[PDB]
């Protein structure tokens, strides 16, 4: 009942009778030859025209095609039936198994839970990772975000967190792949299926091959399933593969929607497009969502508008840096920028807090000396600044850890370090009780006993 009148890249303009014009976010449909293309309308221009984004390849669309107005938004299968199966942004099944036997379908555009319904939790969550749960511990039902440039470790860290939190956790889990490699999606799907945990994980994948509309709405498609599991009273894990692609897909389409560019070419609605999503991924009095989000930062610029606007939406922020990875120190977490809302004397006790702040103070004091060391060499340091520097380097080594998901890289077996077992090691290194050991005795070990034991072999 409508006609296409323009096709610019991924956005399509359709003309409808004056009395039948679709509402915003309603989904239309077009027979793109031997295909069916779904359009989601974004704007009601004047005069019966409506401007839409194509959820599929735009190539091959003629002008004057006839489009059919489905009178409901995009709607996805949801609930227990969607568990262990891979789905499109449109909720269609993408693995070769049969239809999804869903009972109920939900629209992917929803309002955030009221301020009245929220809940807060002090209950700490323990992970096998020394640096994370020393410098930036995070709590059940809260948000975590891994910030990093290209290729510094924010996917390996998320697979380790999956291994350390998600297998040892009873409730369901959801993994949304937003604009990342399909190779990794296949690898993860087969790891899960071969370890027989796939029947507890729901997978939505909108990877980098797909056109902008899929990358734009796949994150909402995943949040909708996480929200269904939440409202059933359960408690859920939600892993998002790269949330930056969700705003990049909006930047790609913004100018075609006819909107003036903002600071660095970003859409003018960047902060709202980002908040309207991240405000509904939260725990509530009826159930809780614990979420880990990888956040790409372009050109390693932590002040680019997108990471800068993302920082405010997270409880624990872990910042990965290339200048640490190039030293071979993995995970390449920057401990002078990682932080957590949970790091308080009231929440983690006085000993944990005091050790964390001591580590920060030593490492910052070491940063302050790096220029004088660069110009005048290390022999010009006072006799105790040399001690500060040696302990700082030992701590830098000791934050490294081997991971079970990195055996493919280094061969060394993974290590799981309990919190009680790491604040003791750092108290030791700081108080001076391990000055005798060489620096390389701390590199890529688990507990501190492994370091004193490694020193015996040099």
């Amino acid at each position: 009942t409508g006609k296409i009148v323009q096709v610019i890249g991924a956005v399509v303009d359709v003309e409808f009778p004056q009395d039948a014009v679709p509402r915003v976010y309603d989904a239309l449909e077009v027979q793109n030859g031997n295909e069916r293309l779904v359009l989601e309308v974004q704007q009601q221009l004047g005069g019966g025209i409506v401007r839409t984004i194509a959820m599929g390849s735009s190539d091959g669309l003629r002008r004057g095609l006839d489009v059919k107005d489905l009178e409901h938004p995009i709607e996805v299968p949801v609930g227990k039936a969607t568990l262990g199966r891979i789905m499109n942004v449109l909720g269609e099944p993408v693995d070769m198994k049969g239809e999804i036997g869903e009972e109920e379908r939900w629209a992917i555009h929803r309002a955030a839970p009221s301020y009245e319904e929220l809940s807060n939790s002090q209950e700490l969550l323990e992970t096998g990772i020394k640096v994370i749960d020393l410098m930036a511990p995070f709590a059940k039902g809260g948000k975590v975000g891994l910030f990093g440039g290209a290729g510094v470790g924010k996917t390996v860290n998320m697979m380790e967190l999956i291994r350390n939190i998600a297998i040892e956790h009873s409730g369901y889990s959801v993994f949304a792949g937003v604009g990342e490699r399909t190779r990794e999606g296949n690898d993860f799907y087969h790891e899960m299926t071969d370890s027989n945990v796939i029947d507890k994980v729901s997978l939505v994948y909108g990877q980098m091959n797909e056109p902008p509309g899929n990358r734009l709405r796949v994150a909402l498609t995943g949040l909708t399933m996480a929200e269904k599991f939440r409202d059933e009273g359960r408690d859920v894990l939600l892993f998002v593969d790269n949330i930056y692609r969700y705003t990049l897909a909006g930047t790609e389409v913004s100018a075609l929607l006819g909107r003036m560019p903002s600071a660095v070419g970003y859409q003018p609605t960047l902060a709202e497009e980002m908040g309207v999503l991240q405000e509904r991924i939260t725990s509530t009095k009826t159930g809780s969502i614990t979420s880990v989000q990888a956040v790409y930062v372009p050109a390693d610029d932590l002040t680019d508008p997108s990471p800068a606007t993302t920082f405010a939406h997270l409880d624990a922020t872990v910042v990965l840096s290339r200048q640490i990875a190039s030293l071979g120190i993995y995970p390449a977490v920057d401990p002078l920028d990682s932080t957590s809302r949970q790091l308080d004397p009231l929440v983690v006790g006085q000993e944990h807090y005091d050790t964390a702040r001591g580590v920060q103070s030593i490492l910052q004091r070491y940063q302050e000396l790096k220029d004088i060391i660069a110009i005048l060499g290390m022999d010009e340091l006072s006799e105790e600044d040399k001690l500060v520097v040696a302990r700082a380097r030992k701590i830098q080594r000791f934050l490294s850890q081997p991971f079970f998901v990195a055996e493919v890289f280094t061969g060394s077996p993974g290590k799981y370090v309990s919190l009680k077992d790491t604040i003791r090691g750092f108290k030791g290194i700081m108080e001076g009780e391990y000055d005798h050991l060489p620096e390389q005795a701390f590199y890529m070990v688990g507990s501190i006993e492994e370091a004193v034991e490694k020193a015996k072999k040099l």
Partner: protein, 55 residues
């Protein structure tokens, strides 16, 4: 002994300061790459704001 130690102090400060001058020289060449990158980025951002703001 005192006088030999004094001549050795001088011969050591000489080489220390030679090394420090070479380190300063090798640091200028990195600061200038950072500087040129910042100069280019500023020209680009300003000129893009003007042009794409107009009309």
């Amino acid at each position: 002994g005192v006088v030999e130690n004094l001549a050795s102090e001088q011969a050591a400060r000489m080489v220390a300061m030679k090394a420090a001058t070479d380190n300063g020289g090798s640091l200028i060449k990195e600061l200038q790459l950072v500087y040129n990158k910042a100069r280019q980025a500023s020209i680009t951002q300003e000129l893009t704001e003007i042009v794409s703001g107009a009309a």
